Design an enzyme around this catalytic site. Structure first.
Site, short mmCIF file in Angstrom:
data_model
loop_
_atom_site.label_atom_id
_atom_site.label_comp_id
_atom_site.label_asym_id
_atom_site.label_seq_id
_atom_site.Cartn_x
_atom_site.Cartn_y
_atom_site.Cartn_z
N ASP A 42 0.82 -1.19 0.00
CA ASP A 42 0.00 0.00 0.00
C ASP A 42 0.87 1.26 0.00
OD1 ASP A 42 -1.91 1.90 0.28
OD2 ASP A 42 -2.46 1.38 2.36
N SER A 80 -0.30 15.53 -12.12
CA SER A 80 -0.54 15.14 -13.51
C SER A 80 -0.75 16.39 -14.35
CB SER A 80 -1.74 14.20 -13.59
OG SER A 80 -2.11 13.96 -14.92
O1 LIG Z 1 -6.36 4.24 2.65
C1 LIG Z 1 -5.77 4.64 1.65
N1 LIG Z 1 -4.97 3.88 0.89
N2 LIG Z 1 -4.73 2.57 1.26
C2 LIG Z 1 -5.73 1.71 1.46
N3 LIG Z 1 -6.98 1.92 1.29
C3 LIG Z 1 -7.83 0.77 1.65
C4 LIG Z 1 -6.84 -0.23 2.24
C5 LIG Z 1 -5.46 0.34 1.99
C6 LIG Z 1 -5.89 6.06 1.22
C7 LIG Z 1 -4.76 6.87 1.25
C8 LIG Z 1 -4.86 8.22 0.97
C9 LIG Z 1 -6.09 8.74 0.66
BR1 LIG Z 1 -6.23 10.59 0.28
C10 LIG Z 1 -7.22 7.97 0.61
C11 LIG Z 1 -7.11 6.62 0.89
#
Ligand SMILES: O=C(NNC1=NCCC1)c1ccc(Br)cc1
EC number: 3.4.23.22
Length: 330
Positions: free
Chosen positions: A35, A199
């Site tokens: 992640d 971007s």
């Molecule tokens: O949680 C985030 N990324 N990772 C994962 N999501 C679900 C499981 C793992 C995420 C990170 C930054 C922003 Br802005 C929105 C969402």
């Protein structure tokens, strides 16, 4: 040193990708969701509330001769999708694709939210954003990448996610056989702890490219591509019958549609997401309404280049003193 590990879709929609990770001595192999949008390495464990474990493989620190409790340390995290987990912390030996870190913080879940319980294929997360986001208290811990960095041949990792197919995470080297053309690098802001970049614009299908700055994050842990409402409306306007459904929670489209591609800019370069990548299938089993893979970021506060976008590219996460991001077609 280097490492190289295959990453595999968890389901037929590419909802997430799992990568095997060796933890402890003897090795306990868990399948983790890598992640780039978070900075905690946490696992289902022998400490996880029993009713919250349903088919996952667990880490048992008492069976690892190299595990040590990190005394007093706790962690607690919430993700963008509303999911969460928390627990305590061990240090142990962690290897990914042949690359080994000793003394890695392995965050053992005592509690996980229902979406984690319900997903039997994900045994935990391995965060690859900047260590400033790590949630361990009172002593913040480093990510696997940050711990490995000094030993790596080059201070980089790469994400090469597959469309309905396995792909690869590499650490410490750029596989020049894994992409076509050249890699275009672009500046990163680390101010929010993410791989945040700008971007240079977009196109819908065969349409003209619109030059416009779109600030967002490269997030392997988010499934979809979340962009400003103006951009998303322009995309779905090209799909007959597509509409935003408040009841479903985003744009839906007739499953009978053929979707246009979506192009995003990286400097003067262009990454094309084929239309098929944007199809997330029936909203419920048997429905002829399909869920879109490009959705509005309105109310998130930032745009998210999630898997839908990243899997169209070979992506370099350059963790040099001044970090940058590279994108190539493939
Ligand atoms: O949680 C985030 N990324 N990772 C994962 N999501 C679900 C499981 C793992 C995420 C990170 C930054 C922003 Br802005 C929105 C969402």
């Amino acid at each position: 040193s280097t490492g190289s590990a295959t990453t595999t879709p968890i389901d037929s929609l590419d909802d997430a990708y799992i990568t095997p990770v060796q933890i402890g001595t003897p090795a306990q192999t868990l399948n983790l969701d890598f992640d780039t949008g978070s900075s905690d390495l946490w696992v289902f464990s022998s400490e996880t509330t029993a009713s919250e474990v349903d088919g996952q493989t667990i880490y048992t620190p008492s069976k690892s001769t190299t595990a040590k409790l990190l005394s007093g340390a706790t962690w607690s995290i919430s993700y963008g999708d509303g999911s969460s987990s928390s627990g305590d912390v061990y240090t142990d030996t962690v290897s990914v694709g042949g690359l080994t870190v000793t003394g890695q913080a392995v965050e053992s879940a005592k509690k996980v939210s229902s979406s984690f319980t319900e997903d039997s294929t994900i045994d935990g997360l391995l965060g690859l954003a900047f260590s400033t986001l790590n949630t361990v208290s009172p002593t913040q811990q480093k990510t696997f990448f940050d711990n490995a960095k000094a030993s790596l041949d080059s201070p980089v990792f790469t994400a090469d996610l597959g469309y309905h197919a396995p792909g690869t995470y590499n650490f410490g080297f750029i596989d020049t056989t894994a992409y076509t053309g050249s890699i275009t690098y672009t500046a990163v802001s680390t101010k929010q702890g993410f791989w945040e970049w700008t971007s240079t614009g977009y196109a819908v299908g065969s349409g003209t490219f619109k030059s416009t700055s779109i600030d967002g994050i490269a997030d392997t842990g988010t499934t979809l591509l979340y962009l400003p409402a103006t951009v998303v409306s322009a995309y779905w306007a090209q799909v007959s019958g597509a509409k935003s459904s408040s009841s479903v929670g985003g744009y839906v489209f007739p499953c009978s549609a053929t979707l246009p591609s979506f192009t995003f800019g990286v400097g003067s370069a262009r990454i094309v997401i084929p239309g098929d990548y944007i199809d997330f299938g029936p909203i419920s089993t048997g429905s002829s309404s399909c869920f879109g893979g490009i959705q509005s970021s309105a109310g998130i506060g930032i745009n998210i280049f999630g898997d839908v976008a990243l899997k169209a590219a070979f992506v370099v996460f350059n963790g040099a003193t001044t970090p940058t991001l590279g994108f190539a077609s493939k």
